[PDB]
Design a protein around this motif. Structure first.
Motif, PDB file in Angstrom:
ATOM      1  N   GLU A  76     -14.660  24.788 -21.015  1.00  0.00           N
ATOM      2  CA  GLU A  76     -13.984  25.615 -22.143  1.00  0.00           C
ATOM      3  C   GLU A  76     -15.112  26.867 -22.386  1.00  0.00           C
ATOM      4  N   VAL A  77     -16.221  26.859 -21.892  1.00  0.00           N
ATOM      5  CA  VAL A  77     -17.271  28.075 -21.874  1.00  0.00           C
ATOM      6  C   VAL A  77     -16.932  29.044 -20.948  1.00  0.00           C
ATOM      7  N   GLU A  78     -16.891  28.549 -19.586  1.00  0.00           N
ATOM      8  CA  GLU A  78     -16.175  29.257 -18.465  1.00  0.00           C
ATOM      9  C   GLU A  78     -14.672  30.031 -18.459  1.00  0.00           C
ATOM     10  N   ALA A  79     -13.873  28.863 -18.915  1.00  0.00           N
ATOM     11  CA  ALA A  79     -12.262  29.371 -19.220  1.00  0.00           C
ATOM     12  C   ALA A  79     -12.543  30.793 -20.375  1.00  0.00           C
ATOM     13  N   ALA A  80     -13.451  30.590 -21.299  1.00  0.00           N
ATOM     14  CA  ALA A  80     -13.526  31.486 -22.541  1.00  0.00           C
ATOM     15  C   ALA A  80     -14.317  33.186 -22.000  1.00  0.00           C
ATOM     16  N   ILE A  81     -15.232  32.715 -20.938  1.00  0.00           N
ATOM     17  CA  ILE A  81     -16.014  33.846 -20.187  1.00  0.00           C
ATOM     18  C   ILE A  81     -15.049  34.668 -19.495  1.00  0.00           C
TER      19      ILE A  81
END
Ligand code: MG
Ligand code: MG
Ligand code: MG
Ligand code: MG
Ligand code: MG
Length: 80
Positions: free
Chosen positions: A57-62
């Motif tokens: 979710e962090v990478e998909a948000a970045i």
RNA sequence: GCUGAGAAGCAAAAGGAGGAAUCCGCCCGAGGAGGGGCUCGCGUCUGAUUAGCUAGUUGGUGAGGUAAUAGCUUACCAAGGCG
């Protein structure tokens, strides 16, 4: 956790932490949100750190939330 | 990498953006493509009521010079070159 954290810069000073959390809750569950404020003037510095429960979710948000317009202002979404 | 048989000798840099990732640059080589420099075969007007012209001129060496070959330059040697 630092890899589970996302730095958001160029946030408008009129943006509440509720709206930031709402726009960045689409990519997944948010464990915490810390907005950075000047110690002396108490004013919003214009950036914050967001800790997500998962790194996916962090990478998909970045990736997809970069340049995203919040309150008429384009914000920079990257890793911490 | 450059000079040199070698021994050796000699030569470089620049940061600006961004919160970080990263971007645009910087220096030295080695290629590519494109753009230029040179050399040569061939073709490239009229006049014989224009017949001889050329002496750095035509070649050779030594030193220089050019990004590069070359009388490109210069000194010496030879007497050629074109018709
Ligand atoms: Mg030096
Ligand atoms: Mg600036
Ligand atoms: Mg800076
Ligand atoms: Mg014609
Ligand atoms: Mg002479």
């Amino acid at each position: 956790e630092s890899p589970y954290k996302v730095y958001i810069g160029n946030l408008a000073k009129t943006v509440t932490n509720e709206l930031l959390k709402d726009f960045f809750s689409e990519k997944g569950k948010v464990l915490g949100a810390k907005v950075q404020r000047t110690p002396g003037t108490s004013k919003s510095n214009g950036f914050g750190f967001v800790s997500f429960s998962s790194e996916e979710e962090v990478e998909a948000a970045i990736q997809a939330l970069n340049n995203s317009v919040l309150e008429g202002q384009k914000i920079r979404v990257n890793k911490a």
